């Protein structure tokens, strides 16, 4: 019961890092063999870090607008001593180029494993909106 | 290396069962606590079997058209003695109501665990097209 | 903790009655001073039973199609010995006039009171789709 | 008969606070376990204060335009010594970015309980327009 | 206080007569100098009975479909011993040519006078939908 | 015959006051229990003065453009010693934001009563265009 | 004052003849040098009877549908012992090819002269709809 | 034969006055009981001078652009010693806001009477374009 | 003055022949070196009879519908003992494939010469609609 | 054979004059009783010079752009000692308001007579584009 | 001068053969090394007979509708004892699937050479419509 | 075999001259009796040099943008000692008004003759795009 | 030079087999490790025979319509004793469901290798239209 | 197995050169007889270097924006000692003129041969997007 809390804590940390534009921080939580389905891949299965490094260097760098993220009804499956899965709904509140409020939704899955006594994210599937807020 | 083959074999079996409209068969491979993201849920996270039982009783029952399914570039992560994850691209070839050929694509993730010495599917995330071919 | 279960049980019963087209049954669970916000009222606050009696006599009577209803993440507030409130999301699966599957969503609130030792529904607010499935 | 007046008085106070952009004031009238259905949640059931805190910090702060709000035909149910429900129609008059007059309508439900001898709002369902005037 | 009830009673009777297609009955309640604003006049002020006699002879005659009419929040002004005014909102529920339910709204004013000890309708203004249900 | 002239005279005075933006003047001619149907109410029946006070404070204040109003074919019913009704068509000529001429039409009903030996307007129904010229 | 009545009587007779499809009757009331502006002339000024004779032989012949015509607010100028002018608005109620009611408006001028002690129509200008009801 | 010339001469004079923006001149040629059908009246029959006085004070005042008017195929009926009617087609050439040439057509009727030994225009019907050139 | 009448008479005869579908008759009135501008030539200048012979053999042959043709304001120039030109406007009334009346306009020029003591048409220019009625 | 050359020479001269904006020159070649069909007349037959004088005073005056005109396949009929007709196709090359090249086509007829030993143009019919290049 | 006639004669013969659907005849007039630009080639340069043989076997075979072809203003260049070129405009009149007349235009070039004392067509360029009439 | 090379060489030279805006050079290679089909003629067959001289004086003069032209798969027929024909596809690469690259295609035929021992172009047919690059 | 002929011969044979619906024949010419880019794969790289086997069993089986295929300008590279590449343009002529002719274009590459002394196709890239004719 | 690595290495080098705008470098890796299918050729098969030289001189020269290219799932066939083929999917990430991120996909084939002991690219087929990123 206590193990579900630390998956949600770790997941929160990861999302924080991304919104902060901290590539250094992000690289410590992801497995170096990470794979992902996301809208920016145009239906392709991407693998490794360097496809993502572009957005941390050229988009997230300029992040100045106020933002808020809410995680709704997380379901955690624990499937060994060192293995976990989480499914959740994500709401992001942001302000657009007109100065008006906006909200966008994505539905998301992450898979976790614990090599060397540290949790690492090995896979990610993002659906509905992209990871960055929709336009 | 040999453990990746049996995940792909088991995944194939599951997809076969669905196309066949065999609810009995389908219920043996899924965990009774299965959860899923799929377009038919309208962005909601559904849990348990009875949301799916409707399509096996009222749609799949009438399945008469010829169909072919191809799995492209499956990536398998093995994350314990009894835990596995698979990501893949799915192409379905089918014939429409005009009698013309059609093809549709979905991109898909499944998570697997082995309680009682049998593999069970615990989570599913489907993206692009629905599980049944698009119109 | 046990009182939340009987609100969800009673709410289920009410929804059953409506789908069944049982006006007799429906009249026993509702307060005779019931009020409602629903799309069929065109933004107006209707009160009493006879606005609803039309659909039980002229629409629900003919109900023949297969249907399934799922209640997602019900939140119950208990606010006295004899007073309760419930908020929930409703998914309805149905088959259309072409013979194709459909799903529709509504988000809903009900308020309950217990005069004479029996639960009665005193107010209802329906949002998104109407009470009957959308077209 | 006298208890219906103090529900309408309290409801008026709450709406005043929101239009004024007074988060401090707003937090005293709402229950800390408040839940709401509103268009900004995109069909989701939100809970707690911090989803709302964003608009008091980033939108309502800048409120400068003249505004008027009218409550039409409030119906109050009183359902214990310490429990009440109110349904009402809301008209808001405002001036747009062109300097022209506008009016918008919402239809609304609030549920009230009296712990510690003070009325607290425990649930809210907003329909038609959002809480802030429509564009 | 009692005089407001008999205006609402008389108004109900008139609406009944129209839906029934009873021209004989309708002619007894209206003043022979009746005037009206209604959508069928195309923005013109019509006077006397023979413009209306057409619909009782050629449309209302064929009235076979089920119908229900609800009067919402009637306001009555009494302005002498023998003079009254009523404003109200009207909801009509009907079934269309596809066999589907429909609802339409009109907002309406009637003026009443009592020559020879019998109430007579002297003016009518109809707005939103026409007197017969909208298509 | 002479009593029809003073209703038309009084009605003219009222319309003058509105176009002039004289709230003080307007308040003396209307009954404090005035009710109205007008397009700005969005199909609702408004009552009392403060819904109208907004336009005298924020729109009519700025009235600078040339305007002309013509009343066509007024019909007056006199229904006691102290009670009257008037129906009329209104044409307004105005100049738009391009500097081009425009004309708009509304069709209108007013009801009058004479408490304390002074005529007061008790009800108003406006149809076609709003009270202010259309855009 | 009495001479205005016989112009309206004569005008009524003419309109009757046209709706009846009586070319014989129509030819007795019109001057043989009649001229007209009407939509069927496509902006041209037609003169004499034979342009009109086509519609009495090929359209009006088949006239079977129920019809009603109302003349609103006729203004008559009398301009000698034997000379008159009339301006009026015409409403026609008719039933369309779907079996639904319709109404159309035209605004019309006729000029009259009395050679040989009988009134004759010398000119006609028709505007808005054509002489026959609009589609 | 000679009397047809002076009607065309007088008609020319009137049109000149209007294009010149000479309200003084215009008032001498029209009967004080003039009536008209024109597009600016929105299908209504206007009477007297003050509806027209607006355009001489606020539009025609600014008339600066070059203009030319041509009268085509005038037909004159003479119907007493002191009574006449004229029907004609009018072409107006003008330059638009882009500096490009434009032409517009109207088809027109005027009725004339001679009280006190001076011709006066008693009625006017304008069709196609308005009196001022079309945009 | 008398020579203008015989040009209009001859022109009438020609138009009669065409509507009648009489190629024999048509060939006697036209010069064998006839040239024409008409919409059927697609902006080309056609010469001789055989381009026209197609419509007399394959379209005009089937002419069964009622038709009427009116010639408006013919202008004739006579330019020798044996040479003439005519310009005119043509209105055709016809019944369409729905059984509804229609009217179409063309504007037309013909040139005439008298070799061997018989008038012959040497050129034709047709504008607006084609020679046969428009669809 | 030689007489066809002088018609084409004279026609060229006329077109030159128009493009040059020389009203003086143009008036010497046209008959004072000239008539024309042209698009600027809106389907009407204009007669005399003053309708054309407008374009020489207000459009052609400003002619500054480069222009070229080509006459294609002129057909000349000679129909007396002093009477001629010409049909031709006209291509005009011009530069538009963007500075891009444009070409437009018209198809044209002119009729010529020789009073007092000088050729004069008595009629003109222009089709496709107007006389000035199309936009 | 006489050699231009036999090119036009030979060209006529070829077009006859095509419309007749005579592949045998067509093959005798074309060079076996014929090349062509035509719309059916989709912008490609086709060479030899077998691309054309398809339409003689599967389209032209069924040719039943009446057709007429006119050749306008042929220009012939003769460029040796045995070499010629022709440019021309082609009008085709035909009847469509509704039974209505149609006309289509193409502009065309053919090149001719005389090996073995017989004229042969060596190249063809077709522009505007295809060789068969347009739809 | 060697004669095909000098036709392609000469054709290249001509295209060079046009792109260079060298009218002097262009006039030496073309026959003074040149004819052409090109889109700028609007479906007409133009003859002689002066229609083309306009573009060398008013468009090609300003040619400043970079351009490249490629000739694909030229087919040459040689049809005497002094007579030749060439068919080819032309690709032009250019930069537009936004500064973006563009490519356009035309398909083209030229006919050549050798009077006085120098090759001269006698005919040209251009299809798809115009001679200058498309917009 | 002779080796280019046998590649074109072999390529022709393959295309024949496909149009014939001969899966047996097709399997002998392709390498069992064949890969392809084609529109039916939806941008994916397919490998092996069984994706293609569907169309030979369910589409090509029913092939009844007349068809013709033309190969334009094949370029062959020979790159060893046993290795070759071919690029070509393909035109297909076919008849549609209306019975009208159609043509479609694809541009295509094939790669060939000679194991065991027999040519085998190892790769295919198809662009523009699909392998079967476009709709 | 080792030979597949050097094809992928060489292919990477080529793509690098293109993005860098290094024409010198690009010319060393391509065969001087290179052929290509690419969208810029408009369906044509181009051959040699000078069609490509335009983009290295006029587009790639200005390349300043950040860019990233990813090669997905390369398949290599090796078909001799000196002959190879590669098929791959290409994703390009770039920033647009608004400063927003973009991604585009192409699917691509290259053929390689080793004359003189150096690998040279002999053919290229590009599909989906062009070689430069899509707009």
Numbering used by the authors:
A (entry chain L), B (entry chain F), C (entry chain G), D (entry chain K), E (entry chain A), F (entry chain J), ...: 408 to 542
Sentences from the paper on this structure:
The calcium calmodulin protein kinase II (CaMKII) is a multi-subunit ring assembly with a central hub formed by the association domains. The AD hub, which evolved from bacterial dimeric enzymes, extends the β sheet to form lateral contact interfaces (LCs) needed for ring assembly, while the ancient dimer contact was preserved as the vertical contact interface (VC) in the mirror-symmetric two-stack hub. Linkers with variable length and sequence between isoforms and developmental splice variants, connect each AD with a peripheral kinase domain (KD). Here, we present near-atomic resolution cryogenic electron microscopy (cryo-EM) structures revealing that hubs from the α and β isoforms, either standalone or within an β holoenzyme, coexist as 12 and 14 subunit assemblies.
